[PDB]
Amino acid sequence: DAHKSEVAHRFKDLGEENFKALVLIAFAQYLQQCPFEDHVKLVNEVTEFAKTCVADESAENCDKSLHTLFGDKLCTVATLRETYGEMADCCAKQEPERNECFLQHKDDNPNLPRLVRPEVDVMCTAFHDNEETFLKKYLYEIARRHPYFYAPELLFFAKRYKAAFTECCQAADKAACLLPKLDELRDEGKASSAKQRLKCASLQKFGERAFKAWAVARLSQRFPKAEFAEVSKLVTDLTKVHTECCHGDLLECADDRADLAKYICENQDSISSKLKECCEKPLLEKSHCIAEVENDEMPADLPSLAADFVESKDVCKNYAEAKDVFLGMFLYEYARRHPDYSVVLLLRLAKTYETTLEKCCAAADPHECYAKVFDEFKPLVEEPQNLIKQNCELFEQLGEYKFQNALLVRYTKKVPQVSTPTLVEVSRNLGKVGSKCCKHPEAKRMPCAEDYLSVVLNQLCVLHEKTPVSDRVTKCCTESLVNRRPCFSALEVDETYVPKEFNAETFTFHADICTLSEKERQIKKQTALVELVKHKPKATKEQLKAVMDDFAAFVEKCCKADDKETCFAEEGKKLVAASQAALGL
Ligand SMILES: CCCCCCCCCCCCCC(=O)O
Ligand SMILES: CCCCCCCCCCCCCC(=O)O
Numbered sequence: 001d002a003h004k005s006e007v008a009h010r011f012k013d014l015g016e017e018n019f020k021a022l023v024l025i026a027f028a029q030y031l032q033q034c035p036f037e038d039h040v041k042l043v044n045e046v047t048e049f050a051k052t053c054v055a056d057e058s059a060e061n062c063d064k065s066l067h068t069l070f071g072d073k074l075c076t077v078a079t080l081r082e083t084y085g086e087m088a089d090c091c092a093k094q095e096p097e098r099n100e101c102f103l104q105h106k107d108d109n110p111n112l113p114r115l116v117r118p119e120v121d122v123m124c125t126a127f128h129d130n131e132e133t134f135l136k137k138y139l140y141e142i143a144r145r146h147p148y149f150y151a152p153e154l155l156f157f158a159k160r161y162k163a164a165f166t167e168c169c170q171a172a173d174k175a176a177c178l179l180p181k182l183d184e185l186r187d188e189g190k191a192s193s194a195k196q197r198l199k200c201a202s203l204q205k206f207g208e209r210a211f212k213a214w215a216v217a218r219l220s221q222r223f224p225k226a227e228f229a230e231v232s233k234l235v236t237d238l239t240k241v242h243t244e245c246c247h248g249d250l251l252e253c254a255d256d257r258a259d260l261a262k263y264i265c266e267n268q269d270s271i272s273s274k275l276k277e278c279c280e281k282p283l284l285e286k287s288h289c290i291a292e293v294e295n296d297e298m299p300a301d302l303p304s305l306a307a308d309f310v311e312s313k314d315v316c317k318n319y320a321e322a323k324d325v326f327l328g329m330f331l332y333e334y335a336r337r338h339p340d341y342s343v344v345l346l347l348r349l350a351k352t353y354e355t356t357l358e359k360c361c362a363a364a365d366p367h368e369c370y371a372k373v374f375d376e377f378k379p380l381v382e383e384p385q386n387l388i389k390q391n392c393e394l395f396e397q398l399g400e401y402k403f404q405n406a407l408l409v410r411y412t413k414k415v416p417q418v419s420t421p422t423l424v425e426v427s428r429n430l431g432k433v434g435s436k437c438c439k440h441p442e443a444k445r446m447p448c449a450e451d452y453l454s455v456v457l458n459q460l461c462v463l464h465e466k467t468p469v470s471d472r473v474t475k476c477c478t479e480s481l482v483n484r485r486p487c488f489s490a491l492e493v494d495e496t497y498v499p500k501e502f503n504a505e506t507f508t509f510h511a512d513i514c515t516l517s518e519k520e521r522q523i524k525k526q527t528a529l530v531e532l533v534k535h536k537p538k539a540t541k542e543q544l545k546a547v548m549d550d551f552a553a554f555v556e557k558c559c560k561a562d563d564k565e566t567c568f569a570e571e572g573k574k575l576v577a578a579s580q581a582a583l584g585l
């Protein structure tokens, strides 16, 4: 932005620590197989080189582009071909195709084992020793396992990791403090990874007019006082930002985000008052602050839509000759008044409005034909309101764990053809959504649950379609964006299903069970619960509790037994007995 040097410019804004944090990510996400130490020297080189340009913006390569700089360094990797090989012919190519070629050679599934969580004591100790290397090690390990993960986001997760350690590493029961939180942040990070991929998948299969419509609604809720032209300006920026972030171009994604963080804070008066504190913080501190900001208050000087979008005579004209803008306004208007709504409900209403006009416009008397359309919103709006109210009541009268159990039983009776894992996972995650969002007051529940919800349905939509088993689920999964959830809400109990033969599955076991945590054990109860319901699709709570206890007892006993694999074998057969009867079969 009129800065001879772009790197030293980025270095001033970011800062030394953030700058090293971000390079480490970038390189880790291609150099997944290179050693950590080789990375540290790399960041040290890049960081030294950038300070040379900080001092003299007219030094060397300090005029060159970041893409060139980056790609040059990555070609310097001399062990590349041995470890990577194909990513080396990316270097023969010149820019811009060179960076395009690297981009293509990122591995979505690095061939790397999962992380072995150490013990609280040793981790907190290694954290204390050298905090800075600890969080670099973490960044390295995560980045290299999540290559298309957005680097700023990851870095903010990093700082949150730092903060939870700083807290629990100076605490008494440490374990009974950290592990609860490590489980929270792990879940938030998969939430974020999966949300990214969803938006990028949505952009691709739903164009961009769609993503733009998403943006119109989201911003207008956050910035109800923004004048529509500002909103539109941001929609366009954000559109590009997201377009690049999805492409997998860190540099562009990261630097365009900083630009947009600049503009927004600069025009705080027109956009929102709530940017007060944000716009003060450092570069990638405000940045997340803006995105984390709370909704400004709407005006009270606010009429109904009706006059402009239902009553007005030159409406059909307006649609036809300028469709995008007219509906654009609808969206902004509808949204700015309704921050309690989820985005895709707002899209659903807009699409309902669209679908009317397309019809009523090229018709006899358009007015009386479309003049009833806001009454068609009422149920589209209430259906989800009821769902969340009623699920949250249930989540509240039960706890997380017993709420998962409810949904397990419910959803297995709906779609018993689905794999047991998919049901367990889906019901668990839905419960977590109750943990995260039910605590909030109604006006913030839909927005809060939406991100999570849409990612979870996706996860089942993905899994299922890898090996389809249910035509009712297929339909919902290949229904449109806006019809996806209602389809899922309309699933009814499956009658035709023929229960399973009362045999093994989750009835053959070993003493590998006696040695498991609450978490691993409740996933096994949950697994065992779903199976039961498959064996008896009309079993009951009082029937299931009874079998579940006989299960629980079979564990307590065989686990507290002198021999195990003999006990589990003898009593193994005799539990299918005391279950088959109990269920009423
Ligand atoms: C309490 C767990 C999450 C909610 C479970 C209800 C499943 C139906 C989804 C309808 C909710 C619409 C609003 C939203 O989630 O954004
Ligand atoms: C297990 C397949 C059926 C539903 C799976 C996802 C549930 C959440 C979104 C749809 C809401 C369903 C309403 C309900 O729970 O009764």
Ligand SMILES: CCCCCCCCCCCCCC(=O)O
Pocket: 509, 513, 521, 522, 524, 525, 528, 551, 552, 555, 556, 557
């Ligand atoms: C195959 C058995 C399913 C039950 C879940 C795994 C074992 C945990 C049972 C819950 C009670 C704890 C055991 C005990 O009381 O000793």
Ligand SMILES: CCCCCCCC(=O)O
Pocket: 007, 010, 019, 022, 023, 026, 046, 066, 069, 070, 071, 073, 251, 254
């Ligand atoms: C994340 C923006 C900071 C600069 C990263 C690329 C530097 C380089 O490889 O020359």
Ligand SMILES: CCCCCCCC(=O)O
Pocket: 209, 210, 212, 213, 216, 324, 327, 328, 329, 331, 347, 350, 351, 354
């Ligand atoms: C894209 C489906 C939603 C209705 C049209 C509004 C789109 C826009 O504001 O760009």
Ligand SMILES: CCCCCCCC(=O)O
Pocket: 187, 188, 190, 191, 194, 429, 430, 432, 433, 452, 453, 455, 456, 459
């Ligand atoms: C954040 C708690 C978990 C709910 C979000 C969905 C997780 C996933 O599908 O990976």
